[PDB]
Amino acid sequence: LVPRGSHMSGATEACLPAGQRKSGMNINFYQYSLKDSSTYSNAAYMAYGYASKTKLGSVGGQTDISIDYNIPCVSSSGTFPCPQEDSYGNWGCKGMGACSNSQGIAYWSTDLFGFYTTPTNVTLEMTGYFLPPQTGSYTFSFATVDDSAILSVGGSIAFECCAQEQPPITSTNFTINGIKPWDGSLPDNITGTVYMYAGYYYPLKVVYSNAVSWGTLPISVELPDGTTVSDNFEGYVYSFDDDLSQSNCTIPDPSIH
Ligand SMILES: OC[C@H]1O[C@H](OC[C@H]2O[C@H](O)[C@@H](O)[C@@H](O[C@H]3O[C@H](CO)[C@@H](O)[C@H](O)[C@@H]3O[C@H]3O[C@H](CO)[C@@H](O)[C@H](O)[C@@H]3O)[C@@H]2O)[C@@H](O)[C@@H](O)[C@@H]1O
Ligand SMILES: [Ca+2]
Numbered sequence: 001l002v003p004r005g006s007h008m009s010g011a012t013e014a015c016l017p018a019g020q021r022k023s024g025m026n027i028n029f030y031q032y033s034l035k036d037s038s039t040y041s042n043a044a045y046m047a048y049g050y051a052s053k054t055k056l057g058s059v060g061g062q063t064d065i066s067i068d069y070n071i072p073c074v075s076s077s078g079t080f081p082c083p084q085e086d087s088y089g090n091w092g093c094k095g096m097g098a099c100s101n102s103q104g105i106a107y108w109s110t111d112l113f114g115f116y117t118t119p120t121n122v123t124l125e126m127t128g129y130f131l132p133p134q135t136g137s138y139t140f141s142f143a144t145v146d147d148s149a150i151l152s153v154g155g156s157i158a159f160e161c162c163a164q165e166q167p168p169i170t171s172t173n174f175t176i177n178g179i180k181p182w183d184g185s186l187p188d189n190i191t192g193t194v195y196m197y198a199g200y201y202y203p204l205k206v207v208y209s210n211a212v213s214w215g216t217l218p219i220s221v222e223l224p225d226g227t228t229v230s231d232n233f234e235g236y237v238y239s240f241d242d243d244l245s246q247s248n249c250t251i252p253d254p255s256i257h
């Protein structure tokens with residue numbers, strides 16, 4: 001008469017928040033030191049230790065969540081962002097000539113979500129809930145990572161149901177571990193799969209850090225129907241203000257709810 005449930009309580013925890021839904025993710029920004037090539041290599045830091053550093057500010061309602069930050073080239077014709085693959089020599093930017101500025105200093109810009117900060121050296125935390133329209137397997141991916149990132153899905157993994165705005169939880173059970181290894185870079189097209197049931201809200205956390213110059217995090221998901229959603233997650237990601245009083249908010253096992 002009923003489904004048997006995923007084996008060994010293996011279903012990912014989801015949520016049914018009852019409050020006012022808002023489109024998009026919240027992005028919190030935290031201090032990260034220029035040219036610090038070690039802090040971001042610790043799992044504890046990328047899961048929650050980032051929030052022990054100074055919080056710089058925040059922006060809400062973000063649906064286009066990929067990162068593609070290019071440093072300036074101060075050129076003969078003005079100052080323009082340089083795609084990393086167009087940088088050359090010591091140094092110039094293709095179509096611009098030689099650049100007079102250093103690749104090794106901090107730069108200030110609104111390129112990350114409109115928030116004025118130093119995209120060269122920062123950590124950010126994206127939170128919200130992913131709403132699957134289809135029941136099945138979802139494959140999240142980072143096409144590349146510069147410098148360090150994680151993605152976590154699920155209640156008690158990304159954050160607690162109905163508690164999006166709380167200090168980070170301590171889970172290191174990342175869905176995608178894109179942490180910069182101690183020994184030098186990771187492979188591209190890093191991925192993690194989650195089985196999701198339609199209509200339930202799945203906590204989603206992305207933590208991303210840049211230590212110097214370029215920053216890159218192209219985020220995608222492959223849906224059960226085999227199509228891919230890249231960069232702009234409008235229609236899939238939502239936020240809810242905390243409601244720690246909502247007793248029934250956590251769905252430990254969506255296949256038997
Ligand atoms: O062929 C390129 C380069 O090769 C040799 O130089 C190698 C490296 O020398 C140093 O360690 C640094 O200059 C590296 O440059 C990276 O790091 C500095 C910070 O120390 C950045 O200012 C610079 O933009 C560059 O950053 C890249 O790597 C970072 C760490 O992985 C990323 O965070 C960043 O986004 C970017 O990808 C040099 O690469 C020499 O032969 C030299 O002549 C050549 O130009
Ligand atoms: Ca819990």
Ligand SMILES: [Ca+2]
Binds near residue numbers: 147
């Ligand atoms: Ca970088």
Ligand SMILES: [Cl-]
Binds near residue numbers: 093094095096097
């Ligand atoms: Cl050129």
Ligand code: NA
Binds near residue numbers: 068
């Ligand atoms: Na880029």
Ligand code: NA
Binds near residue numbers: 072081
């Ligand atoms: Na610029």
